[PDB]
């Protein structure tokens, strides 16, 4: 009995996303292939965020990812600031900036 | 029991940086991020289906929701990553 996520080539669970789509009151019927798409997109976003955060952590000679590294990774690039414009990250501080 | 994405975020990280770790609070932050983005995309897909007199959410609704939510090249790469998964899963099944 191959799992759906392994069948699709993902790490994130396709079955759990299917269960969350059905019980979440989104549509009357959740056609298959929608959990696969949403799981792939969620995995891509999580992987991109994690890789940028780890790149920020390595540049600081740190072996662990703390909330400050996540805040730096999100605010340091566009299209991730836009996606998370209204989000406050706890224990994340502020971006270093001074005016003339 | 509290369902979390923590078990999957640990394994996804180990593929990129096999040595770095995640503290408890930053993992809570990432879990909230994943739940938030899931909520956004699912709500937009449901609105898309309701707008069109359709009673089902398919991969096309989710694609259009991704194109509406995610900005620019970030949306462009998520569409190609999500289409690769639906294709491979369909052929195997």
């Amino acid at each position: 009995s191959q799992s759906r996520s392994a069948k699709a080539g993902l790490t994130f669970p396709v079955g759990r996303v299917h269960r969350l789509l059905r019980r979440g009151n989104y549509a009357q019927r959740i056609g298959s292939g929608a959990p696969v798409y949403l799981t792939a997109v969620l995995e891509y976003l999580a992987a991109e965020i994690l890789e940028l955060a780890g790149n920020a952590a390595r540049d600081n000679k740190k072996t662990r990812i703390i909330p400050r590294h996540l805040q730096l990774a999100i605010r340091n690039d566009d299209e991730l600031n836009k996606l998370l414009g209204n989000v406050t990250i706890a224990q994340g501080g502020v971006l270093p900036n001074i005016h003339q | 029991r509290k369902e979390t994405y923590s078990s999957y975020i640990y394994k996804v990280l180990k593929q990129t940086h096999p040595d770095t770790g995640i503290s408890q609070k930053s993992m809570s932050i990432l879990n909230s991020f994943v739940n938030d983005i899931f909520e956004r995309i699912a709500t937009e897909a449901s609105k898309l289906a309701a707008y069109n007199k359709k009673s089902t959410i398919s991969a096309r609704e989710i694609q259009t929701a991704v194109r509406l939510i995610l900005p620019g090249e970030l949306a462009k790469h998520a569409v190609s990553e999500g289409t690769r998964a639906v294709t491979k899963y369909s052929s195997s099944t």
């Epitope: 991109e48 690039d77 566009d78 299209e79 | 090249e73 970030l74 790469h77």
Partner: single-chain antibody, 229 residues
Framework: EVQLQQSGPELVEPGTSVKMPCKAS????????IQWVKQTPRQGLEWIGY????????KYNEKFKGKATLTSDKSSSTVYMELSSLTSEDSAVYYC?????????????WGQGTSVTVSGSMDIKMTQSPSSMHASLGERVTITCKAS??????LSWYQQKPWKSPKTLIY???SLADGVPSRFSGSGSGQDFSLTINNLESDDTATYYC?????????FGSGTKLEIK
């Protein structure tokens, strides 16, 4: 559409500074970084550095730490590049190329390039095995780019015609670039990567480069000239 407009050729004496404009149009300036590359016959392609117009953050190849300085003016959508204390080897062609901030992205579009003419062990070595090959008008081709250390899939393939700016073919080692014929196909991961041209053509005569961006300095390939009979 997107074009990275670049100035004309410039001649200058040694010991002097020169500025090159790279105007950007057809897209949002802040979303993408601007990458600078130099091309010579002796050294092939070398990556100088980049600037990110969103936050004006730069990164420099260690060989060009000091010789090249990037500034960006958000008002006129242009990026300037300064070469200082010009020396005999500073003569080459200089391209500005657009890369997105996303890690899977490659140098999508290149500038025309200015011809400037005067009058570091931990790098990723990119070994392109076939230095040249002759082929007929429709068989298949394979070009190999081996990498010394592990780069996961951050490898893209480039075609550069004689006296033209390069064109992107593959990125992320498998994905097909935009507006590229389906016959081109790439493969590989880890250490060994390959490019394949299925139906050869009259318009497929150029030098083919492999580029990696997994590590801190981006190291181009060595080159491969393909002549078709």
């Amino acid at each position: 559409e997107v074009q990275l407009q670049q100035s004309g050729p410039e001649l200058v004496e040694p010991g002097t500074s020169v500025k090159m404009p790279c105007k950007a149009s057809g897209y949002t300036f802040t979303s993408y970084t601007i990458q600078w590359v130099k091309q010579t016959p002796r050294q092939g392609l070398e990556w100088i550095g980049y600037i990110y117009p969103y936050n004006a953050g730069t990164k420099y190849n260690e060989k060009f730490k000091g010789k090249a300085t990037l500034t960006s003016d958000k008002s006129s959508s242009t990026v300037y590049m300064e070469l200082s204390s010009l020396t005999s080897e500073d003569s080459a062609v200089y391209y500005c190329a657009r890369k997105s901030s996303r890690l899977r992205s490659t140098l999508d579009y290149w500038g025309q390039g200015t011809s400037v003419t005067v009058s570091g062990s931990m790098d990723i070595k990119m070994t392109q095995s076939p230095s040249s090959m002759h082929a007929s008008l429709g068989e298949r081709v394979t070009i190999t780019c081996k990498a010394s250390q592990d780069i996961r899939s951050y490898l893209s393939w480039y075609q550069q015609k004689p006296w033209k700016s390069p064109k992107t073919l593959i990125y992320y080692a498998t994905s097909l670039a935009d507006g590229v014929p389906s016959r081109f196909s790439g493969s590989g991961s880890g250490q060994d990567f390959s490019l394949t041209i299925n139906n050869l053509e009259s318009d497929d005569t150029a030098t083919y480069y492999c580029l990696q961006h997994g590590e801190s300095p981006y190291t181009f390939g060595s080159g491969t000239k393909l002549e078709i009979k």
